[PDB]
Amino acid sequence: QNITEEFYQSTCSAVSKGYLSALRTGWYTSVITIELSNIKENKCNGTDAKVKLIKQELDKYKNAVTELQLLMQSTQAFLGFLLGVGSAIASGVAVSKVLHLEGEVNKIKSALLSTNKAVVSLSNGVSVLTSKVLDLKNYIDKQLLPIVNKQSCSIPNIETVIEFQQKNNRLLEITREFSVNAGVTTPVSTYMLTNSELLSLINDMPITNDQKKLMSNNVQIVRQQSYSIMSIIKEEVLAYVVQLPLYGVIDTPCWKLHTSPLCTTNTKEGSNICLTRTDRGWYCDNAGSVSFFPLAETCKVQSNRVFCDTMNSLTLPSEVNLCNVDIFNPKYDCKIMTSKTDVSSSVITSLGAIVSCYGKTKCTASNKNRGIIKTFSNGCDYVSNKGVDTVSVGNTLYYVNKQEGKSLYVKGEPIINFYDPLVFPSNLFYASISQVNEKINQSLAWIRKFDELLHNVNAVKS
Amino acid sequence: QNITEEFYQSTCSAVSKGYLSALRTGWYTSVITIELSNIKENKCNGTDAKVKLIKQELDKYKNAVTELQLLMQSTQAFLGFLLGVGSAIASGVAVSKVLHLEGEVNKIKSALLSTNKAVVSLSNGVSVLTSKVLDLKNYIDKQLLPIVNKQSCSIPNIETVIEFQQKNNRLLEITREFSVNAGVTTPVSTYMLTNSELLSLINDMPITNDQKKLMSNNVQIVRQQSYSIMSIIKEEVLAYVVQLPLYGVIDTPCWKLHTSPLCTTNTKEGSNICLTRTDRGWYCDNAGSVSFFPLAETCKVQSNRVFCDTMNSLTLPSEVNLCNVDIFNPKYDCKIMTSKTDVSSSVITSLGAIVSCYGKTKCTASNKNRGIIKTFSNGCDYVSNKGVDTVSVGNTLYYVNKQEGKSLYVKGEPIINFYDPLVFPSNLFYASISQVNEKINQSLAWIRKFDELLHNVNAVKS
Amino acid sequence: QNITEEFYQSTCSAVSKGYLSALRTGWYTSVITIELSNIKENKCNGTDAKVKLIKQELDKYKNAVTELQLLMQSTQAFLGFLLGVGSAIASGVAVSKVLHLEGEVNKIKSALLSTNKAVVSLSNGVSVLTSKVLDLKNYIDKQLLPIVNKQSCSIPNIETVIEFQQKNNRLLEITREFSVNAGVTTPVSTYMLTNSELLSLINDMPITNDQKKLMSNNVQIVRQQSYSIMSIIKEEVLAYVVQLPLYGVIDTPCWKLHTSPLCTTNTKEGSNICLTRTDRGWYCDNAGSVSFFPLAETCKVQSNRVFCDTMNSLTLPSEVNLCNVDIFNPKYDCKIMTSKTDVSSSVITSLGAIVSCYGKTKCTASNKNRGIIKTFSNGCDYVSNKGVDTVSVGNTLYYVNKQEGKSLYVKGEPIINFYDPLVFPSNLFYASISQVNEKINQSLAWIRKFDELLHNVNAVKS
Numbered sequence A, B, C: 001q002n003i004t005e006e007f008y009q010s011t012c013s014a015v016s017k018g019y020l021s022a023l024r025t026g027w028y029t030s031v032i033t034i035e036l037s038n039i040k041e042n043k044c045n046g047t048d049a050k051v052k053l054i055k056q057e058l059d060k061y062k063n064a065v066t067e068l069q070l071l072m073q074s075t076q077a078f079l080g081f082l083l084g085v086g087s088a089i090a091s092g093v094a095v096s097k098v099l100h101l102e103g104e105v106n107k108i109k110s111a112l113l114s115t116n117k118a119v120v121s122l123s124n125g126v127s128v129l130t131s132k133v134l135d136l137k138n139y140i141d142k143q144l145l146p147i148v149n150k151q152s153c154s155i156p157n158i159e160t161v162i163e164f165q166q167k168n169n170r171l172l173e174i175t176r177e178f179s180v181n182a183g184v185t186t187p188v189s190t191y192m193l194t195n196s197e198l199l200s201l202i203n204d205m206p207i208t209n210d211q212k213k214l215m216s217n218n219v220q221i222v223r224q225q226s227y228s229i230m231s232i233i234k235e236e237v238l239a240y241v242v243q244l245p246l247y248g249v250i251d252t253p254c255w256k257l258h259t260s261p262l263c264t265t266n267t268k269e270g271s272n273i274c275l276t277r278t279d280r281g282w283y284c285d286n287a288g289s290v291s292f293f294p295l296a297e298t299c300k301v302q303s304n305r306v307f308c309d310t311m312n313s314l315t316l317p318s319e320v321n322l323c324n325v326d327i328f329n330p331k332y333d334c335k336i337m338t339s340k341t342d343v344s345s346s347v348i349t350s351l352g353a354i355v356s357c358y359g360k361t362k363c364t365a366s367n368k369n370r371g372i373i374k375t376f377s378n379g380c381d382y383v384s385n386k387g388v389d390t391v392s393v394g395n396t397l398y399y400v401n402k403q404e405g406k407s408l409y410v411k412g413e414p415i416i417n418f419y420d421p422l423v424f425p426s427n428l429f430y431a432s433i434s435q436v437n438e439k440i441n442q443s444l445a446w447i448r449k450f451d452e453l454l455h456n457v458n459a460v461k462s
């Protein structure tokens, strides 16, 4: 853990380096089966309460099975706008659709006749891993049928009721979780796949030992980037499909960019111009190029490790890293946006905070022991979380992050002081440096042409 | 199931036809009641464990009732921006507010004195359907009071504890689900309304048989577009309001539009212009006009049937369908947006995928048996899911949808090759064809006027 | 409850006054502890079913503890774009990180040796409130060990199994809720903090009596603006951190602004200009200034009281209230946006509805007794919820809110009739009154200069 952070005063932005990558670059699909029963009907002219409880539990089981069948017979009769779209569950749904052909269920049942785990080939020629996580058929047919199938339902025992309830609870919960999500669920609960079974699926994937260890250590995130799909219920067997991620890129450098608006500080109201850098997010080296994640909601962090998803990313060249040290470079075209609004805000970075204090707003950073230790002036400034606990930007109070690290301050004149406020192209959402430069150079051309003609007409007088 | 898809090369967009509509055009409200008890106090100088368990369950019941009373005494002392706003629970909240007038609870209790279902008229003159889904009062008053009301609490039986737990669990879950949602819940769980009661409410609505059948078959979606509202707890009765949808438009044609950016392929960096069609979403014929759903999150699909919601829609004329066959028609004004960014992406359609490959990005589509089967050039292209499993657009891998259907390819020169790159109005977010045409015709007017004057001054020399 | 609403016809917007404020201006953190056990191993050569049930429950407990340890050893090896960013759980995470130093667990255990509540000082010098909400150690070590530690596991009793299940359920649920949320949860469930313990924490905060009463009455919202953070599991004790809000500003006036587009009604298609007010949200007086909440998802309402959050707000001067009575005031610069789209929509306010009816759309408001009672013309209009139940704007049907109040109608000519349609700066997303005025005054300057030169050249002929 050697996270470092730099502040660039010339553009009012910060970069945090020192992380490691774990990117998702594929999917893995398996099949999970449950062996049910087909209890026909229960009939007793009894009066004991234990028989009543047994009948109630059996009724709940039948209702769950019927609801599952009914559900099955319904499916088969700033730069966030630059991203393409895709379907997240295409592979699992394809496997589920393959499962509906005739003879597949017989193949699955024949494969797992003796053992609880096997590898079977489907019709099209794909091999998937199967499992049998529960078996209610044997217990029901060997315990409950002798009590209630033909006899007068004489005497169940008190322990049998509790045992049956404990057995049936998991199936009830699985039915409940499929029911409300219309078939496809979000992070796979403990009922769908036990923590002792997730660690067993991982030790069967065709991956390297390092990826196996990474998936085993951080198992609470593999569970948050997975899907579960209901497939079929027929011929006394239940089957659903689990879709697990694959991490093909591991241990490559990553960094994050924090940006804030940078304005001018003229006293006259409504006489200030601003610009802001719009490309803020996560960047990670990936096979000779940089991947950009702008949604700020697809990447998780565990203290040095970032678990991103490559379906909501952009592939940029390796020169995108050069916008930091220099902004007027003739090799990349950094992205900005312009406006004319002067409002104070603050951005809480990983190792400090950025404060923009424009207008008459009072901005202050305070320590918890002495009290007030800094009074910001008008501009973009940055303070580190070493002796600072909270920062206030007016009516708002923020708490800074207290991670240990090293922060550096880079001086330099702001770039907003180089432009001409009489020709600046305001209200230019999602512009770039070259576009802004082009829009300015041509207005002066019109002005000069006008001046030329005006001089010329006063030259031809005589 | 006869879904069809077309690709229009001239605008880099695709249309998928063949669906059917089921639109929500109203609400239906009912009342669900529960009959509670008013156990005052329990006192025993006992030592048996069964008495302890009974007391614990009674304490949980009292705590749930108290929490419900406390909650009740708190409420009564791209084109996604074009949509208006509305309140989703106005009708249910209105009914709940009507329920608070004096004498309403007496009317409800008198209506359901003997049967479990009745129709009653409130004060203002509206008739609603009531129900009684649970009755703990009779069981408690006829079983638990003889054990603990006055006596020394001699001997409960072991089965009674389990029976009471099973009875009380549902009320505990209902209290839990109201507690965390502040009164109004999202898709109605199995505890609020049993699957055997939802199918009974549907057979009492004033609707046609076809709508009844549609609601009965797809019951997992009627449950996802419904609300539950806590109303009152007083005079030993609990009542909450359920708000069910109504589907007034059924079996009308629908289709979806997929759009992707279309750019120019000049070699020089920063010398390309782009435009994109911004109106992508679901369209459905509705009584002589087309309804547009741009949020891309309000419509569900079950293999040919689309369950949309009409509160987040727009009403467009019937000529909006004409932007597909022609884009320069003098009857509608299709909506576009312009920029100057050249980044590669991909859009996964229903029966294929659209690939945009600009710059130095390597784009490829691969089959799972042979391997690589296509290498895209620079431009907008489209490939169908017949012999293609995955497509990669650089560092990203996508899985195409494997639905069966028929796809067609329509040729034609791209429209971006007709414009003049010296006067093209870039950075024009949310423009239209006529606006872009107007902004170009007037710059040439200024240029021609300038040329006219410049020639004229050199005509008056002598 | 004296809510009032006004409609300003000149700008097609409405204001609803009469509310009260309860703003969050800080955090409060406490520690919740659970006393576990360290059962080593269970071994019985038994055959009774009760022993089997006991062993199963013990196995579940061990699995929960192991999963918790594994999770712990993973974290330590329109104007919505104007808002700054911040970290919501900085304080709780800081306290959790402080908890990991050596000797802290010993201090916590020594503080709560005898009582269930104490105040203890950590290493850095901060005092926090601790608690002991559950004790499984004593029950396990005094009941289950005599049954299964060394003996042949002779006879458990039937009531012991149920008692142990009831004890263990809460720990199982806590483990389940941490497991799927990766450590940090959203609104604190009933398992993490009992409703009888939340009301006990509130009576220990260093706050005034009025804030205590406000927090006690509306306890279902204090629970929705809180976080729970997993911290540690070691040395036979479990500890997690709860982060509760603080309400520093209470009983200050608030109001809401509703805005809708305002267009021109020329008959020719594609010849209309529009403008819309973009600053819609909640405003609340706060210490000599107004706080603006634009996200429309951070503020809740209970019939006169608004529970907002100050982390997603903006601090504006006190002159922002002046845009309502007048829009051309020389003291503030109200924010608008321009376009050229004519589409009909509707905005449902608190005491009525705003209807915009442009083009050939049919807009109508209907009562539930007579039927149709109003037919809107082309323009922006407003109708109150007194004799009106629903309003339709085409293919869409809306339900108005039926709250009691007083509404007022303010006449005045629309401002869109003052501009010149030949120089109006369309497609100017997020503009302002002064910017639009500036962009118009300078085009006329160019036209006049052109005319001047053209006259001048025809003056020098001879």
Ligand SMILES: *[C@@H]1O[C@H](CO)[C@@H](O)[C@H](O)[C@H]1NC(C)=O
Residues within 6 Å of the ligand: A001, A002
């Ligand atoms: C991290 O920095 C520390 C300095 O305290 C030192 O151990 C070394 O430079 C780095 N350790 C690594 C990269 O393992």
Ligand SMILES: *[C@@H]1O[C@H](CO)[C@@H](O)[C@H](O)[C@H]1NC(C)=O
Residues within 6 Å of the ligand: A437, A438, A441
């Ligand atoms: C000046 O005009 C040239 C075209 O001749 C253009 O390429 C350039 O971007 C403009 N601005 C500057 C600063 O050179």
Ligand SMILES: *[C@@H]1O[C@H](CO)[C@@H](O)[C@H](O)[C@H]1NC(C)=O
Residues within 6 Å of the ligand: B001, B002
């Ligand atoms: C759907 O297409 C098939 C062609 O395979 C044929 O049955 C018919 O054209 C269509 N059936 C319908 C619309 O029911």
Ligand SMILES: *[C@@H]1O[C@H](CO)[C@@H](O)[C@H](O)[C@H]1NC(C)=O
Residues within 6 Å of the ligand: B437, B438, B441
């Ligand atoms: C040309 O100018 C006319 C106005 O005289 C305008 O209506 C039209 O949109 C412009 N462009 C074209 C292609 O006609």
Ligand SMILES: *[C@@H]1O[C@H](CO)[C@@H](O)[C@H](O)[C@H]1NC(C)=O
Residues within 6 Å of the ligand: C001, C002
């Ligand atoms: C609210 O209005 C009512 C009028 O019916 C009246 O009691 C008084 O003006 C107000 N009451 C308050 C503010 O307590």
Ligand SMILES: *[C@@H]1O[C@H](CO)[C@@H](O)[C@H](O)[C@H]1NC(C)=O
Residues within 6 Å of the ligand: C437, C438, C441
């Ligand atoms: C007119 O031009 C002046 C600059 O001389 C500018 O300040 C003003 O905003 C423009 N418009 C009006 C209506 O005065």
